[PDB]
Amino acid sequence: RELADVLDAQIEMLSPFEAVATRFKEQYRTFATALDTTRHELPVRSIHLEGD
Amino acid sequence: NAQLSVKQVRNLRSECIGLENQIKKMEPYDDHSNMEEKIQKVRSLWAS
């Protein structure tokens, strides 16, 4: 009885996350790829502008 | 020896009758048949 109660409780703790987890991890992978790109495309070697 | 055996028998069937009275009473739910099976999904959730 008590083991079924605590098991049932962790079922409603765990159940809603599994559906959203796949979309969450795919969009996190895409946005982390975007973060890698924007970190890989910030060239910083300059001072007060001379010429161009 | 006779009186100690009598007292021990009295205690035994006292706790006995208490046990089948609670067995009649405190069990209004029984859904154990899926129990182990659900435990499988449980670790799958943990694995996830």
- Closest by CA to B42, choosing from A15, A5, A1, A2, is A15
Most distant CA atoms of chain B, gap in Å: 64
Q: Note which residues in 6-35 of chain B have CB less than 8 A from chain A.
A: 29, 31-32, 35
Is B43:A12 a contact under the CB 8 Å cutoff?
Answer: no
Give the resolution in Å.
Answer: 8.0
Asked if A21 lies within 8 A of B45 by C-beta distance, the reply is no
Pure H helices in B1-48: 2-25, 35-47
Beta carbons of B32 and A5 less than 8 angstroms apart:
no
Give the rounded distance of the alpha carbon of B42 from its chain centre.
24
For this PDB entry, the determination method is cryo-EM
Give how far A30 is from chain B: nearest CA, Å. 20
Which 8-state DSSP code applies to residue B32? G
